[PDB]
């Protein structure tokens, strides 16, 4: 997170850490959407261009963490993966379209003051809240510039209009993704960076006080560059797929 700040304890109890077992390292961020299912970005697990293809046995998920490097005993929970489900139409060859993946845990996790699931957007929340100008929240242990935070970071960013997103990059933007961030003229900075990918973009509902995950940190040219915006996987539009694999494999 570029230009963010230290997250408070428990302010993002759905935050998950995708951790590589050997050698030990932070791969990506992710989120808790149920007691047995975790949501993250597809390019975090599969990406042929870089010869990247992590399977269940290469990883472990760490829930309820705050410190980036310590083994927060009795607070964080480590879980193994039973199965990874990558979107069949994930487009890594052209524009990271449908950059999403589901991970089922070997055993359910117990919730606490540091571990609690986030909400998935519904028709009402999605149509009502995903509008330009409104702002969400991005969290993660990624780099502070394009070096590493000792603790979970947080930054609030405003959603940007399709046009401005479209003409900010030469890549083919799709409807399965939106962009967020301030404009050069708005005089404020902030963005996700190496390591936040896969993390959630949440919004707090003014109607029922609940937090919803509108997006997944997907990609972006550089980190916090003027005239540039971060792109996130549109979770709502891919909800039909999410629900499908959870009803059939959960």
């Amino acid at each position: 997170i570029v230009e963010g700040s230290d997250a408070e304890i428990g302010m993002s109890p759905w935050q998950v850490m995708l951790f590589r077992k050997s050698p030990q390292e932070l791969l990506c961020g992710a989120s808790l959407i149920s007691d047995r299912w975790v949501l993250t970005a597809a390019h975090c697990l599969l990406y042929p261009p870089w010869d990247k293809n992590f399977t269940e046995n290469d990883l472990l998920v760490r829930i309820g963490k705050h410190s980036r490097t310590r083994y927060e005993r009795n607070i964080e929970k480590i879980s193994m993966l039973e199965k990874i489900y990558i979107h069949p139409r994930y487009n890594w060859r052209e524009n990271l379209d449908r950059d999403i993946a589901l991970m089922k845990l070997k055993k359910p996790v117990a919730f606490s003051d540091y571990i609690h699931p986030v909400c998935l957007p519904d028709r009402e929340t999605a149509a009502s809240l995903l509008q330009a100008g409104y702002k969400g929240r991005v969290t993660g242990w990624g780099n502070l510039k394009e070096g590493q935070p000792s603790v979970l970071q947080v930054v609030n960013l405003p959603i940007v209009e399709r046009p401005v997103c479209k003409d900010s990059t030469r890549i083919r933007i799709t409807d399965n993704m939106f962009c967020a961030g301030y404009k050069p003229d708005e005089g404020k900075r902030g963005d996700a960076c190496e390591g936040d990918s896969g993390g959630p973009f949440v919004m707090k509902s003014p109607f029922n006080n609940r937090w919803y995950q509108m997006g997944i940190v997907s990609w972006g040219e550089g980190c916090d560059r003027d005239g540039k915006y971060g792109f996130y996987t549109h979770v709502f539009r891919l909800k039909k797929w999410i629900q499908k694999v959870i009803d059939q494999f959960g």
Partner: peptide
């Protein structure tokens, strides 16, 4: 999923965020 998005250390005890207030203020601007 029945208790989704309700943080035990915040919402669940009428306590606010250092910055959540900023998100709600954008619903009017």
């Amino acid at each position: 999923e029945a208790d989704c998005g309700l943080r035990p250390l915040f919402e669940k005890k009428s306590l606010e965020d250092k910055t959540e207030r900023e998100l709600l203020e954008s619903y009017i601007d």
